[model samples]
Target: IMGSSVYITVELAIAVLAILGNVLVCWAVWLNSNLQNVTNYFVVSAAAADILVGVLAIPFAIAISTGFCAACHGCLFIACFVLVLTASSIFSLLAIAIDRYIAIRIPLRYNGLVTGTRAKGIIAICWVLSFAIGLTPMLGWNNCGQPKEGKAHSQGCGEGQVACLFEDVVPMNYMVYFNFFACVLVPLLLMLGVYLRIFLAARRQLKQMESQSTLQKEVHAAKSLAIIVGLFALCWLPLHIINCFTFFCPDCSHAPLWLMYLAIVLSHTNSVVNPFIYAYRIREFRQTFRKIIRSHVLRQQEPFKAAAAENLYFQ
Candidate 1:
């Protein structure tokens, strides 16, 4: 009981932090023109999904944990909705990886190929596909209305009673085969391959153009985006692995509830970590974040005025 309380507390903290941190990321991109590139657009897309996870999914999860959803259909919908947001996040990461790959391979043609309109269209496609994949259970791939068995199955809503539990409603078959292997695992592997190619291409280009600043900048951006992809895999892999065990070994002893909760919390924490990653690894984001904190939070105007006066003096 105490362990459950601790897990709930941590989930609440992660939800608040994910919301706040990702809002800052979106705000930073909104106010900074320098961050308005195609790659950063994908970052914003990912952050938006993260924000929703905090605002909607986490609270829904907390409610489900407390047995708040009395209707089976409502519980299933809430669980499916969480999957949709996570699917969107993964797709956004894949978009970013592909965008970086294009930038690295075709430095001269990058802008023409990945314009603002095209980038927005790609983002729209990602969300559409994510919704399609995430809501497959709602289309009848789920375990709802099935005969109950075992401790996990016994928790499901039965007869006139109601219970809201993810595993109880959503089938492990869907979780392992469709969600993990098809949606999450495949995209992650593709991103890994893309990043490998990007690094190789960047190395070759750098060797050829030792003095080219543009090439260097592209390489730096590729590295940062690759780090983001890596982080996403790190955060979400554990939960998927647990799902694998559940599906493959239904009769075997599975992970404890506390450990499972930890994996879920870890996945949610991914949303909280991305903004910090931007602040740490990306110099432009770092500078813009500082500027925002100074100009808005601290209300420091003297520095801006001094810079303005210096510009005038130079002119």
Candidate 2:
């Protein structure tokens, strides 16, 4: 019980921090015209999804974890909501990867190829597909009426039962086969391939023109996006692996409750980390973030005093 409290406390902290941090990210982009770009649009999209995860998914998870969801369908809806939000995040990451790939691969034609309107369209498609894939279980692809006779851990709702547990309402096959393998793993692999090509292209550009500032900027941006993709994989793969274990070997003993909670916390940690990465890795973002803090948090006027301070800092 005490250990569970620790997990809940950590999750709650992550939830609050994810909301505040991502909101700041979006605000930074909004206030700084120089930071606006096609890639940052996708970054804001991912931030929006992370905000939803913090506001909706984490609270639902906390409720479910504390044995609060009594209705079976309610539990299922909560689970599906989490899936939609997470899927949106991953799809946004894919969009960012593809955007970076195009920028690196076609340096001269990137602006012509990826316009703001087209980027918005792509983001729309990502969210729509995420909703479709995440809600498939609600459309009858779930374990709604299945018996749990042979399953080793069958504490979940099954065949007229009213228990509100994740494994009971959400099907392992949907998680493992459909969600993990189809939606997540494939896109992750594709993103990896896309990043590899981007790296090669960037390397070629660096070798040919080592002093081109434009090429250097493009390469740096690609490196930052690649780091985000790497962190996403590190945070999410463990939970998916556990899902695979549950689906493939149901007779085997399941992971301990603490381990499962830790996996979940790790996944949620991803939502909070991206904003920090942006501030740390991207110089424009760092400057914009600092500007925001100075103007807003410090409550300073920017007409003369702030400009003088800014000049002094630069000097």
Candidate 3:
């Protein structure tokens, strides 16, 4: 119990921090006109999804860990929150992949293809597709309907609920594999391929250039996106591994409790680390962040309020 409490505490901390960081990203983007770009738009959407993860996932997890009756809200809403957030996260990555695909595969069309209006349309379509994919739980004969007492687990929408999603042995198993492939591996490979092409393009561009400042900028951009993908992998890899292993014939009756806790921490930590890594590293993003902080404080702190411009401008 003590160990579980310690883990819950850490998980709670991560959730709180992610909320702060991602909200900062949103504010930063909103405050700085220079930071406005299609790529940054996607970054904000992704951060919003992480914030949802922190808000929805961690509270339920903490309640479950503490032996509270898990039936507070129907499992339906719980499932909705998680699956939607999952879809949002994956969809954001897929959007980035498609953006790169166009940006590199056909540079001539890239500028026209990824205009701001088009970017908003792309985000709209991404969410629509995500909603469609997550709606699968409703379509399937999940046998996962409603609530019951003393049920250790069941196939319903919840975080530590007494319902077993894994009960649909073959389907759930395959779904896990498909998601792991589609969400994690395939995306990782796509980014890797994209980055390689981008580097080659950079090299070609550099050879014909005199200033080379543009070349350095390209290098930084490539590295920044690469690190975003890497951060996603680091935060999500362990959870997927354990999820896949849940069904495989195991010698032990149960996974080690320590490993369970470890997986929990990593999965939740993904939400916290994402905004800092992908968004904070950009110079424009950093300035945007500073502006967001200024705005946020300005709202709460009268002394620092924007309308009180005289204080800041004084000699």
Candidate 4:
């Protein structure tokens, strides 16, 4: 099944599962203001991007595998979908990480800095950045991997070639580096640097509130943000590094085909796993999700607001 399916069956399954999971998050956040913190806003945006990737890319993949192909349309849709989702998910996560870090490190300033209105502004910037990076295919700066007739008929050699996606190595290398910086390095490094400060600050807060079990929980939870960022780096770094190696290393040409598929899947899966991690492992997020699900009476302060009210920011 795996051999015959290549991208079709497996990727469709991954996409559908991610879509359903993200949709559940979106609905939960929408119906329950208890979940209305700025981090959850990032969750919703990430989900929406996942859904778009599924909507715009997966069906085309399925169609091509089933021997139905639109050539150019397939390439454009898939590339743009890939670009948008990659950017959206990364930037949203970076936004969330920054919020989390600030909430812990600069407790006193988190409220004013991460205000709801300011949150909206940040979300807008996320979209604009997503699109600005996503439109690379439209600019013809890189191939959309559009299908063309046999080269004898004047088009470049079709698939199953070194330059399968584009006319030469340079364009592919160019886009790969651009994406490495924007989608991988920028977010991971930023998240790491911010979380480092946050964890140190959280430790300080824990010391101050030495007797409080609640503060201890916050410490554990803030530690988990660092874990999440680590996951993102682990999942994405291989592909990002290999992308650069492709320019000079002939090894990339000899790399297993399934490894290529695995790399792509892992890179995309980085964004999908964060929602589950927060929903299950983070007790506060779990409680908020349960309140949304059970229609429990919400605390007057929404979760993050409570977070702020606790001066949870003092971390």
1-315 per-residue lDDT for model 3 (tens digits): 223767877888988998998888887777788777776777777788778778886775554444332343334335444555766776775576567657665868777778998788878987886676555555552434543544443233255454422332114454475656766677677767777776777788777876656577567757766776677778778877776777574554766777877876786776777656767777888877776677768678876565567766883
The global Cα lDDT (0 to 1) of model 2 is 0.78
Runs of candidate 1 with Cα error greater than 4 angstroms are 1-3, 147-159, 205-215, 295-315
The alpha-carbon deviation from the true structure for residue 189 of candidate 2, after best TM-score superposition, in angstroms, is 1.2
Off by over 4 Å in 3: 1-3, 63-73, 141-175, 203-212, 292-315
Q: Every model's Cα RMSD, please?
A: 6.9, 6.4, 6.2, 11.5
Candidate 4 regions exceeding 4 Å error are 1-6, 60-77, 143-170, 205-214, 250-252, 282-315
lDDT of 2 by residue, 146-262 (tens): 634433124443444454557777888888878987566887798888877867766887788756666677677767768776887888899889988887887999988988998
Q: Is 1 or 4 the stronger prediction by lDDT?
A: 1
TM-score, prediction 2: 0.84
Looking at model 3, residue 148 earns an lDDT score of: 51
lDDT assessment of candidate 1? 0.78
Span of ten consecutive residues with least summed lDDT in model 3: 163-172
- Taking the tens digit of each residue's C-alpha lDDT, what string does model 4 give over 1-315? 113466556776778777766776777777666777866676677677767656654554344333322255444545565666667877877777777776666778777778778887888999899888876666676544433345313333344422122222125555566777887788888888877776676677767866755467566766677677878887788766666667567555645557656766676566567555655565655665676655534555478668777795576
- TM values, all candidates: 0.84, 0.84, 0.75, 0.74
TM-score of 3: 0.75
The predicted structure with the larger TM-score, 2 or 3, is 2
